[PDB]
Amino acid sequence: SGFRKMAFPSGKVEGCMVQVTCGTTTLNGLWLDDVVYCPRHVICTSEDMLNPNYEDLLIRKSNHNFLVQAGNVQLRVIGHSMQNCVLKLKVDTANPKTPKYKFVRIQPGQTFSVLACYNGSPSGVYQCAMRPNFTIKGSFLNGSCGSVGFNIDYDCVSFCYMHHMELPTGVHAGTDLEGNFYGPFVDRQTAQAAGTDTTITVNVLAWLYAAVINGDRWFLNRFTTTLNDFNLVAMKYNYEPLTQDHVDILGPLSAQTGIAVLDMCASLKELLQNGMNGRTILGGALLEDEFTPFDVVRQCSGVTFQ
Amino acid sequence: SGFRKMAFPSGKVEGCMVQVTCGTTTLNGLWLDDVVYCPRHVICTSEDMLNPNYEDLLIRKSNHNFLVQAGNVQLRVIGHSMQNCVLKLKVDTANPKTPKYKFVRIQPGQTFSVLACYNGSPSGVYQCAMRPNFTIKGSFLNGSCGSVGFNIDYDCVSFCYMHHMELPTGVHAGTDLEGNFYGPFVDRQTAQAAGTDTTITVNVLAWLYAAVINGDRWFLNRFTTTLNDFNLVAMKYNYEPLTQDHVDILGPLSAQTGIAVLDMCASLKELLQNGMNGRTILGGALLEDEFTPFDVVRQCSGVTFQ
């Protein structure tokens, strides 16, 4: 038993983290096959980040201006290109530790594991979630740009996020592995407003189901609610509107615990209206929203990707 | 910026996780060099766990009764021995992915990363802490026995924990890699009382320093306290007594933020006596105690073990 915020094993990703140097700036790159992916603001300086003309800046750079170090190996760049906000540095040799991988663009509310790196070396791994405003609340210091988020499917690594910048409000923004930013963010040092953030309601319900599986049950009320009447309360507390697609997602969790989805929504409503009253759920005093229903089923059944 | 509960990269540990089968029971083993370490209750059944005579049970077993699978490789056991509560299965070939490693016995309050495994395959990684009562609050299902906790020091892996059993109260107990249990626990299915758990005070202060580094500052009071007068309040709220060794541990954190250790203790005292008043610290409403002062300095400076 027990429930933990759990990250994917990072072995298959560690072997792909390299160091990318261009001029004075260093950040992390992703070495898959014979291509190194890294944020395009590695060709910038601190003053360039204000109003960067990335096309004119990259034209100044040639093939031998990019220093790619893989642990103690250094790769020979035999081609470079700019795909949106990511740089594709064609290298000499293919990464022998290249895992089976895909590039995926996730949706708000989905979760993934982040391998925090500095100078191409993995520092740590933690789980996070794409906020509904396309930001993430991670831990990224200077030199952590290019750190990647991923999911594991048995043997296949689904790369979904690349860290690019810290917003002035302390939150983090990034792109997919095709260089397209999540949200309305641009790789430019300016005031960038992230929209109003809401709580992923379907994630909160999955985390309540996980609490029932583990014994914590004081929040199970004797009332119910409808889908509409719950959404009226959800809008008041900045919660995502629950759709029928979300209710069907919680089907398996509903089947295992014998508690209907609408019955758990009334428990959440009373948690929103009345609070927790000094009690805890799975050792916490806030409603956790960083576990998808697939995350809960994974930890509760013991899925082994190896 | 940002602060996350962060686990060590698990690459060096994944390559050492094997499957150990003896009779009907399966659990995870640790393959370092030519020795496989696994809990000794792999030679038991469900009824054996009541009153197990491990010496008489192991004597019934011979060398070819242990089925060790490493991914798709299966190893040839050429020797077996019982060191306390751990089994040492001498195998034919040495693990080619054996990292530089030590066996360490940690102290209560120290933290480590757990690689949750099932049938010898890594499921996920998360950070935890040795509670003052020598238990851990992890996520261990059936078949997760033999999962190991570890710390990374640059290139060296310090193995410190091996999971053995779930206590009836839902908490977890285990041994070091020499087979010696943490706490008064025995590998026997019975009622085993874990002592009163307290909060690691030195960890809470380190987590408050991390909050100051990240901007959250509303708890910084205009009062102070002495070491004794704080310990009187700490005993009332089930907090570990703060010693001079703990104050010196927080020295670097005190030097970076310009806040004396005793000044932060008065802030914690008012947090204990007055609560949080609906506010949050680093996105949480409870006083986190699973970050050692070394953990905070690590995440704040960007230490890369690779």
Numbering used by the authors:
A (entry chain A), B (entry chain A): 1 to 306
What did the study's authors say about this model?
Crystal structures of 11 Mpro mutants provided structural insight into their altered functionality. We employed crystallographic structural analysis together with a high fidelity FRET activity assay by our group to assess the functional and structural changes in Mpro mutants. The crystal structures of several variants revealed the changes in side chains orientations of residues in the active site comprising substrate binding pockets, especially S2 and S4, which might lead to altered amino acids preferences. Accordingly, changes in KM values for most of variants were observed, indicating alterations in a mode of substrate binding. We observe the highest level of conformational plasticity around the S2′ and S3′ binding pockets with N142 and S46 being the most flexible residues within the structures we solved. Also, we observed that the charge distribution in the active site changes quite dramatically even upon a single substitution especially around the S3′ and S2 binding pockets. This might explain why with most mutants we see the changes in binding affinities and not the kcat values.
